Each structure stands twice: as structure tokens, then as C-alpha cells.
Amino acid sequence: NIFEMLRIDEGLRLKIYKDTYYTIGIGHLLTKSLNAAKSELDKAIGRNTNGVITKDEAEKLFNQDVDAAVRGILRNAKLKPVYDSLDAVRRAALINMVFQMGETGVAGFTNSLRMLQQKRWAEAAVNLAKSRWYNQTPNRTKRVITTFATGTWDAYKNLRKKLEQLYNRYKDPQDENKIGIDGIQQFCDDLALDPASISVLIIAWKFRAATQCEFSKQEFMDGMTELGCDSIEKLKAQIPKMEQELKEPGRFKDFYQFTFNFAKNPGQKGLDLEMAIAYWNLVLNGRFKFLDLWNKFLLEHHKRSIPKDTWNLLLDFSTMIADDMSNYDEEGAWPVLIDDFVEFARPQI
Numbered sequence: 101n102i103f104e105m106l107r108i109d110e111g112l113r114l115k116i117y118k119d120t121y122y123t124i125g126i127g128h129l130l131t132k133s134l135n136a137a138k139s140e141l142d143k144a145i146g147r148n149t150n151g152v153i154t155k156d157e158a159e160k161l162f163n164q165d166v167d168a169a170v171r172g173i174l175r176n177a178k179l180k181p182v183y184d185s186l187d188a189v190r191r192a193a194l195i196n197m198v199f200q201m202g203e204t205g206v207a208g209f210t211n212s213l214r215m216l217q218q219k220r221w222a223e224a225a226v227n228l229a230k231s232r233w234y235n236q237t238p239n240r241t242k243r244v245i246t247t248f249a250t251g252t253w254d255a256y257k258n259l260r261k262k263l264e265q266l267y268n269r270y271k272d273p274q275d276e277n278k279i280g281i282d283g284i285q286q287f288c289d290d291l292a293l294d295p296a297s298i299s300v301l302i303i304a305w306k307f308r309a310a311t312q313c314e315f316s317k318q319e320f321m322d323g324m325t326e327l328g329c330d331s332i333e334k335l336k337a338q339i340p341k342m343e344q345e346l347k348e349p350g351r352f353k354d355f356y357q358f359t360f361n362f363a364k365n366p367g368q369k370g371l372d373l374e375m376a377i378a379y380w381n382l383v384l385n386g387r388f389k390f391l392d393l394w395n396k397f398l399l400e401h402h403k404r405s406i407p408k409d410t411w412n413l414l415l416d417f418s419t420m421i422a423d424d425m426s427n428y429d430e431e432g433a434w435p436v437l438i439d440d441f442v443e444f445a446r447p448q449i
């Protein structure tokens with residue numbers, strides 16, 4: 101009920117991540133040292149986690165956070181009268197506000213809280229949409245406002261239904277939890293894109309998809325909600341913003357590094373040469389002048405696999421390397437494969 105509401109608005113992460121602090125699940129703050137976070141989580145769960153938890157372990161930490169939020173609200177002079185007057189569904193919507201911006205942030209909506217306390221649902225819902233909170237998270241705010249306006253889970257129910265009905269269009273007949281090859285095909289067809297195109301790879305990056313030719317129920321549901329999409333037309337309008345992000349070097353590095361993890365076979369530490377070249381021609385297109393000469397060099401002098409470090413450093417190489425390769429330091433920390441490439445390419449100019 102409340103867990104699924106904030107799973108939709110805030111998101112669920114089974115692995116340890118950084119905000120702006122070490123975090124897990126639905127925004128559970130662990131500490132303020134990765135070893136201290138792993139130890140704090142270990143004590144909280146009662147097992148050797150290594151920074152990876154389950155949905156049930158995430159719900160246990162969330163229920164602790166709910167109790168912490170309820171305790172907090174009741175100790176606040178501006179929020180306690182309102183919380184007491186509200187019903188179970190609207191209390192969950194108030195907790196959602198506290199989870200998003202803290203007590204002092206919620207206390208700022210004095211006029212709106214006043215209306216909620218006076219049970220003027222339609223009057224409160226209108227005034228709450230006027231604020232910057234509506235501009236910031238239009239998908240989240242609309243869902244919380246609708247909860248305050250009706251006192252029902254309709255906003256979250258409708259979205260889940262709209263998504264789950266759309267999921268049935270791509271799920272594998274032999275496997276419920278995943279979207280098969282044919283379903284991935286349908287998804288790309290419905291979005292009018294080739295499944296082997298850059299746009300689909302950009303989508304996979306925003307969706308945080310684990311492996312190529314594989315799409316899980318979780319990855320679909322989480323990705324679609326996070327981007328604020330309940331239809332294929334909505335995701336299609338999102339693609340240009342995703343594209344424009346790559347013009348920023350920081351976002352492109354994250355995308356380039358993600359490509360290696362997405363392209364690699366599960367169980368392999370490295371990436372197959374033929375697969376690596378195919379993705380390099382896709383992500384380093386119009387970014388690496390020596391891209392074709394590099395592929396040619398690999399196919400003839402390196403029949404072996406591609407490690408993560410060599411993949412990541414080739415971007416740093418492409419950016420730095422001069423058209424005549426003069427600025428290259430033959431003894432300057434670059435991998436041997438790149439050393440061999442400059443030695444191979446330089447006599448050819």
C-alpha cells in the first residue's frame with residue numbers, strides 16, 4: 101500500500117548507491133566510507149549482504165523509515181494536527197511528502213495543510229498544484245495530489261494497470277517475469293526504431309537494463325515509472341531529451357561505460373572482440389577519428405577479448421589523441437593494446 105506508493109514515486113534500488121551519502125532500497129540512508137555502509141546494512145539485515153539486498157529486505161528497512169517518519173510528524177507542531185485529522189490513505193500521502201522534502205519542507209505548505217485539516221479536498225488539491233513542487237516532479241506530485249483529493253489509491257492503481265496491461269503486449273508466453281526476443285522486437289517496432297540502433301541503446305541506459313536480448317518485468321516497470329511514461333507515445337517524446345544529455349561529456353562517459361556491461365555476455369568479465377567493435381561503431385561514431393583503423397588493428401593483431409579497463413580508457417584515448425598521434429606518451433599509463441595500436445598506426449600516419 102504505502103510501500104508500493106513510494107516504490108512508484110521514489111524508486112527501489114537493491115544495490116548500495118550515492119545520492120549527494122550511502123543509500124539502499126526506497127531512500128534508506130545507511131551512514132556518512134563504503135565499509136561503514138556495508139557494516140551498517142549487515143547489522144540492519146543480520147547477514148553478509150556485500151551491499152546487495154532483496155525486495156523483502158528493502159521493505160523491512162522501509163517499514164522502519166515509515167515509523168521514523170510517523171514519529172517525526174507527531175513531534176512537529178505544524179504537521180501533528182493535520183496528521184491526526186487525516187484518514188489512512190491521506191496520511192500515506194502526507195508521509196510521501198515528508199519522505200520527499202522533510203518536515204520543514206512540508207511545513208511550507210501552510211495554506212494547503214490548513215485546507216487538508218479542514219477536509220476541503222478539492223480546494224487543497226487545486227492550491228497544491230500551484231507550487232514549484234508540481235513543476236519539479238509533475239508525475240509524482242499529480243499522484244500525491246489525487247490521493248489527497250479522493251482518499252483512494254486510484255492514481256497509483258490506474259498507473260500500475262496502465263503499465264501491466266502494456267506489459268502483457270511484450271511478455272514471453274513461456275516466461276511471465278520476462279520479455280522475450282519477440283517482445284523486445286515488438287517494443288522497438290511500436291517505438292518505430294531498429295533494435296540494433298543507438299536510440300534503443302540510449303533507452304537501455306535510461307532503463308538501466310542489465311543485458312542485451314533480455315528485458316525483465318522489473319526493468320520495464322521501474323524504467324517506465326521513473327521516466328514518467330504510461331504509454332509508448334510518452335517514451336517516444338522522451339528520446340530527444342535522452343539524446344541531448346549525451347552532448348555533456350559526463351553523461352556520455354556514464355553511457356559509454358554502461359554499454360560494456362550491457363553488451364557483455366553474463367558470466368564473462370570481458371567483451372567478445374566482434375561484439376565490442378559492433379558497439380564501438382555505434383557509440384564512438386563521429387567521436388574517434390581512428391575508429392576504423394582501430395577495428396582493423398584488432399581483427400588482425402588481437403583475436404582475444406576486450407577488458408573493462410581497455411574499453412573505458414579508449415574514450416579517454418579518443419578525446420586526447422591528436423590526428424598525427426604526436427601527443428601520445430609511449431610510456432604513459434595507457435594499456436599495451438593502445439600502445440601497440442599507436443605503434444601500428446603511426447607509420448601508416
Ligand SMILES: *C[C@@H](CCN(C)C)C(=O)NC[C@@H](NC(=O)[C@H](Cc1nc2ccc(C(C)C)cc2s1)NC(=O)CC)C1CCCCC1
Nearest residue numbers: 284295296297300301303304307309311312313314315378
Ligand atoms: C543479444 C544478443 C545475443 C548474444 N548471443 C550470445 C548470441 C544478440 O543477438 N545481439 C545482436 C545485436 N543486439 C541487439 O539487437 C540488441 C537487442 C536488444 N536488447 C534489448 C534489451 C532491452 C531493451 C529495453 C531497454 C527496451 C531493448 C533491447 S534491444 N540491441 C542493442 O544492444 C541496442 C544497440 C547487436 C547490436 C549491435 C551490433 C551487433 C549486434
